[PDB]
Design an enzyme around this catalytic site. Structure first.
Site, mmCIF file in Angstrom:
data_model
loop_
_atom_site.group_PDB
_atom_site.id
_atom_site.type_symbol
_atom_site.label_atom_id
_atom_site.label_comp_id
_atom_site.label_asym_id
_atom_site.label_seq_id
_atom_site.Cartn_x
_atom_site.Cartn_y
_atom_site.Cartn_z
ATOM 1 N N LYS A 334 0.858 -1.179 0.000
ATOM 2 C CA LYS A 334 0.000 0.000 0.000
ATOM 3 C C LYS A 334 0.899 1.234 0.000
ATOM 4 C CE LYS A 334 -4.117 -1.816 2.348
ATOM 5 N NZ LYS A 334 -3.610 -3.204 2.542
ATOM 6 N N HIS A 339 -4.216 2.508 -0.428
ATOM 7 C CA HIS A 339 -5.175 1.543 0.094
ATOM 8 C C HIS A 339 -6.359 1.451 -0.867
ATOM 9 C CE1 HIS A 339 -7.660 -0.831 2.505
ATOM 10 N NE2 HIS A 339 -7.795 -0.089 3.589
ATOM 11 N N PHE A 398 -12.233 -2.052 8.342
ATOM 12 C CA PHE A 398 -13.199 -1.310 9.132
ATOM 13 C C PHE A 398 -14.431 -2.196 9.249
ATOM 14 C CE2 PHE A 398 -11.041 2.081 6.441
ATOM 15 C CZ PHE A 398 -10.074 2.354 7.402
#
Lengths: 411, 411
Positions: A334, A339, A398
């Protein structure tokens, strides 16, 4: 359980629009981050990211079809075509029912949502496009890819934010292991570099705000990291049952052997301090593979460059591998691509599989001064030759999703 | 393979906010369709739907937590609490790692997307909520549910439009069958009764436009059907490994035995004429269960009330079951609840499991004159007593996803 090998790879990323270009970019530490051009980000807190450049969907897709799908689908379908061509897998009426598609995404067609909401507010609901829904919903990547390739097997879509692509590949892996498919076109895709997406991630203070030096904003494990740098693109793998693959003389990059999913059940966006869930995901991916931690050669880290993730992930790797954690190579690609959210697991699985076959690991660029707690070998600066017998790919997204995929050389 | 039983059910629907109220509503042919009240639909082509009424999330959720999540999550978390309480399943540090969550949705937090885009256009990106992302993304239902219940096992989210809830339950079923979880809180949720959602489905001419008679708009299999009627809500099941369930004396509604997924790879929203994919989904769900077609007692049809779906599904049932298709009971509960999209598979799985345990099948209300090609027994008008030994639930969603789940009495 059937054995599953990776027989094809495809990728459209901020550092290369083909498998070859993407891998060469990774090997050269190519930087895909720059000022935003897809929209006017002058009023945004973050004004840079990893955009896919010089990509024209109509070069690979029928014009009318391309016009009737969003960018996140352009990436998925085109990267999938790449993977199928790379695998030399011929899909026809005779095997179509045993070949499925499983492409995840984190946000899907946000662009369509924004354009249509703008129309609704300005012209009224009657002026909204009749194609809004079939261009906006997350599962359109899998659906359109199946139609394009003629795949009539299981067609699913996992939406688990940063882990979407990893969960997609993991779930596809199970389908082949359990005999529900002979082959699966799987991975992740994302095209969320839009005003609303940036507004939301910036408001949450999740994005890096190093607008004065975008080229060095994404710096996983570095003490001065200040948030992730968004990227867009897609990474696709062709998972295939071993016997079927061998019967057609398929190209084999390596064998997929493990997949584990855990949840912190702690916070919706913040990782648990002790990294217990991530530790268990790594430990269980290894157990699922029947491999000891000492067997690990390389780990393509989630390493998003956020303060909380990088140290928690390092802690998890150390807790799962013990002293061996200091004897392996770990790197976050990344650092170069940004990302890709739902697409991250896809392009990172591609990088991980390539590492196994090429015995070379990509670097974590921009890493100059890692925090005292990020004390592993993150392959800073340049790619490095290394015997990669077993490699893991981490995705801690997340929502509390901890996912680890495990691959190894095919023998 | 481990055996999997259904030990708990939860539901929040347009005809009842609890399992008991929902089932009683189904048994009484309760009509949950009416004019839209959640927003001003005066300028919409369709101005009615199935809304959840008299539901206050703060009655079951912490105030601050409820404020930080969208309605689709309110439904998922609350329906999940219902299922856990119904199952009397105690989740603590000792079993948390073996209990996961898999809740699907078709569109997720669209409301948040619309509210925030409106803010972005009117006040600028800097004024957007820092909670936009964690309230909008589809996987938040699974993530928030895990946090609320303390489930630390696999946490995933399937987004396959109308099949989201069915794929979620099917995938959860595999996790338990394969030993990756001892129990799974699974199902679907949707809260997409918004201006943009209605604008999009209306523009696609997918919704019924019978504004002059909303109570009879949703009429699956009826010759005068003219599109589906959207509904909102959530349906949740607790799937549990048999030995673990028996050890704690768990309540058992029935046993889940089959799951099949196929794809037409034909059109993104229109079903293939011969219904081949749907036929195979039904046939394979039965094969997955080790059951012959003649064993089927009841089928909770997808029956969305759209011209194309209802006849194609009928054809698929007849092609999969042969003459037996005329000897079973088939019904679409969407006639009462409307089409909950991602939540449909959830509440319909709840209805299917209840039918197995209660030996009673819900009706397809509003059915007066079925097309000549829709010639099966759709249990019109009223619920009917019937020995339900084996029951299937169909979901043929936009994107080309054909899914069939199979359940049977626990013996």
């Amino acid at each position: 359980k059937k054995r599953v090998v990776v027989t094809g790879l495809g990728a459209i990323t901020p550092i290369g629009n083909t498998l070859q270009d993407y891998w060469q970019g990774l090997m050269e530490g190519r930087n895909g981050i720059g000022p935003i051009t897809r929209f006017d980000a002058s009023d945004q807190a973050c004004r840079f990211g990893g955009e896919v450049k010089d990509f024209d969907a109509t070069q690979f897709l029928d014009r009318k079809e391309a016009k009737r799908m969003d960018r996140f689908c352009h990436f998925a379908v085109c990267a999938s075509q790449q993977a199928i061509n790379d695998a030399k897998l011929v899909i026809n009426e005779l095997n179509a029912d045993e070949i499925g598609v499983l492409i995840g995404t984190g946000i899907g067609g946000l662009k369509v949502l924004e354009d249509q909401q703008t129309i609704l507010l300005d012209k009224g609901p009657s002026r909204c496009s009749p194609f809004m829904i079939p261009m906006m919903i997350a599962n359109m990547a899998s659906g359109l890819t199946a139609i394009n390739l003629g795949a009539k097997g299981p067609n699913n879509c996992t939406v688990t934010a940063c882990a979407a692509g990893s969960n997609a590949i993991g779930d596809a892996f199970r389908l082949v292991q359990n005999g529900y498919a002979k082959a699966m076109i799987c991975g992740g895709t994302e095209a969320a570099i839009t005003p609303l997406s940036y507004a939301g991630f910036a408001s949450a203070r999740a994005l890096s705000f190093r607008n004065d030096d975008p080229l060095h904003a994404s710096r996983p494990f570095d003490k001065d990291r200040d948030g992730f740098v968004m990227g867009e693109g897609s990474g696709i793998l062709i998972l295939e049952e071993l016997e079927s693959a061998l019967a057609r003389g398929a190209k084999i990059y390596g064998e997929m052997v493990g997949y584990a999913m855990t949840c912190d059940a702690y916070h919706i966006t913040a990782p648990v301090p002790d990294g217990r869930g991530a530790t268990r995901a790594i430990a269980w991916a290894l157990k699922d593979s029947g491999l000891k931690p000492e067997m690990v050669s390389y780990i393509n880290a989630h390493g998003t460059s956020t303060p909380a993730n990088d140290v928690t992930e390092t802690r998890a790797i150390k807790q799962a591998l013990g002293n061996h954690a200091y004897n392996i190579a770990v790197s976050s690609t990344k650092s170069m691509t940004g990302h890709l959210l739902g697409g991250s697991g896809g392009i990172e699985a591609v990088a991980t599989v390539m590492a196994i076959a090429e015995d070379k690991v990509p670097p974590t660029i921009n890493l100059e001064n890692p925090d005292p707690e990020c004390d592993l070998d993150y392959v800073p600066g340049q790619s490095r030759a290394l015997i990669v017998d077993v490699a893991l790919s981490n995705s801690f997204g997340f929502g509390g999703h901890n996912v680890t995929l495990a691959f190894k050389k095919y023998q």
